[PDB]
Design a binder for these strands. Structure first.
Length: 64
RNA sequence: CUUGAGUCUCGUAGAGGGGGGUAGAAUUCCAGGUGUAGCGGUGAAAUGCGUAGAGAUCUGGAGGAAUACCGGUGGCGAAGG
């Protein structure tokens, strides 16, 4: 038996479609993609994307 | 005496008052789903909120307060309003 592949041969969902809900808040920005029924599938933030209080409120921090 | 003053007829606009009712919108709160480690507050944060499952997103339920637009040096009330 040889060594295994570098990248996965299979993937557990393929839901194709969703809605990005943004709460661009006065001190931060929070972005969440949810399926069309509003059950959330995955998310990320300004402040969690490597910015503290002083930077997390900017469109450049939100862009990331 | 009718001219001041008063009165009815009649035309008429009004967020004027008191009593009651109502629709939708929203901030909040509760439950639960989905999801997953972030959230928050300031000049900076700190205090504070999270993984005992937050934030964000969906749906059910709950409360109490107030009427966005219209809106104008506009209209109405003795003034307070």
């Amino acid at each position: 038996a040889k060594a295994p592949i570098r990248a996965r041969k299979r993937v557990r969902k393929q839901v194709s479609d969703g809605v990005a809900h943004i709460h661009a808040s006065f001190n931060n920005t929070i972005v969440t993609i949810t399926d069309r029924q509003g059950n959330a599938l995955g998310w990320a933030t300004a402040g969690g994307s490597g910015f503290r209080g002083s930077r997390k409120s900017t469109p450049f921090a939100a862009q990331v």
